[PDB]
């Protein structure tokens, strides 16, 4: 079941974007799929530019890997950066030039909730180390939906909060001692936040852990390879128990092992 991260496998490339619009992006599957979607449904957002609204949806993995989308959704408001997730039928994304998270229900194309993440920096205040306006990073783990951010009161250290997926209320918050701008990205596995040291290196590491159950911080040295030298997005999927990442045009996955 659950445990501490102990190993990350080699990146596997599933699709490569063919234009610069996909240099950065987010791709994802739903770890709690709901009708009409399934555990194979995949979403892809190419996130370069200033008016990002198109969300590509694929019914089957084979379509994601080789074909055109099954459907394209046009979001009612432009999206910011690479932090979005899908969870239990909704895309959760940050509005451009805002600290607002939006719940967009995919089957009805309806905005169901919006919430300012209180005190969160946005638009280049507390990005990860590559920039990209990556101030606010949503995450799904075994327990549900979270948000990773920082605030002036936390002096740029990573803050994580559990979110109610229905109405986006913050349920509980934890403050780490990890400077968000000093790490390439982060993700949560089994209630532990992990960070990646570098977005360019073939020889990066998963370098810090913060366990929300115990409050304990640790250092780690688990190898992590950025095959294409520019990882813009690194998230965990708790149904597949894999990392999903976006690395310089390439949509990649990594296997992991937990103790
Ligand atoms: Ca992430
Ligand atoms: Na995310």
Author numbering: 244 to 502
What does the paper say about this structure?
Mutations within the olfactomedin domain of myocilin (OLF) cause a gain-of-function, namely cytotoxic intracellular aggregation, which hastens disease progression. OLF is a 30 kDa, Ca2+-bound 5-bladed β-propeller. β-propellers do not have a canonical hydrophobic core. Instead, the radial arrangement of β-sheets composed of 4-antiparallel strands form a toroid that forms a molecular clasp from the extreme N- and C- terminal β-strands. In OLF, four of the five blades are further stabilized by ligand binding to a dimetal center in the central channel.
Next, we probed motions in OLFWT that could be relevant to aggregation-prone partial unfolding. The new structure shares overall features with our previously reported ~2.1Å resolution structure (r.m.s.d < 0.3Å) solved from a pseudo-merohedrally twinned crystal, but the newly refined structure has a low B-factor range (10-30 for Cα, average 15) and limited anisotropic translation/libration/screw (TLS) motions. Furthermore, structural refinement using a multiple conformer algorithm is largely consistent with TLS and B-factor analysis, with fewer side chain conformations modeled in the center of the protein than on the surface. Overall, the main motions in the near-atomic resolution crystal structure are seen in alternative side chain conformations and the external strands of blades B, C, and D. The finding that OLFWT remains globally unchanged despite the subtle change in the NMR spectrum is supported by a number of experiments. There are no changes in the unfolding properties of OLFWT incubated at 4 °C for several months, nor are there changes in the crystal structure described above, which was solved from 10 month old crystals. Second, CSP trends among OLFWT, OLFD380A, OLFI499F, and OLFWT incubated with 1 or 2 M urea reveals that the structural features retained across all four proteins are primarily surface-exposed, particularly within blades C and D. These regions coincide with areas of OLFWT found to experience some undulations in the picosecond time scale, but limited exchange at the microsecond time scale. However, unlike these model systems, OLFWT exhibits limited ps-μs scale motions typically associated with access to a well-defined low-lying, partially folded excited state that is prone to aggregation. Bioinformatics analysis and experiments identified two APR sequences within OLF: P1 (G326AVVYSGSLYFQ) located in the two innermost strands of blade B and P3 (V426ANAFIICGTLYTVSSY) comprising the two innermost strands of blade D. A third stretch, P2 (G387LWVIYSTDEAKGAIVLSK) within blade C, was predicted to form amyloid but remained soluble when tested experimentally.
